[PDB]
Paper text:
We also report the X-ray crystallographic structure of a hydroxyAsn epimer of Novo29 (epi-Novo29), which may provide insights into how Novo29 binds bacterial cell-wall precursors.
Novo29 did not form crystals from any of the conditions tested. epi-Novo29 formed rod-shaped crystals from 2.8 M sodium acetate at pH 7.0. Further optimization in a 24-well plate format afforded long rectangular crystals suitable for X-ray diffraction from 2.8 M sodium acetate at pH 6.6. In the lattice, epi-Novo29 packs so that the hydrophobic surfaces come together, with four sets of epi-Novo29 molecules forming a hydrophobic core. The macrolactone ring of epi-Novo29 adopts a conformation in which the main-chain NH groups of (2R,3S)-hydroxyAsn5, Ala6, Leu7, and Leu8 converge to create a cavity, which binds ordered water and acetate anion.
Residue numbers in the entry: 1 to 8
The structure:
């Protein structure tokens, strides 16, 4: 969840 792990 919350995108790819780049930002979150």
């Amino acid at each position: 969840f919350x995108x790819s792990x780049a930002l979150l």
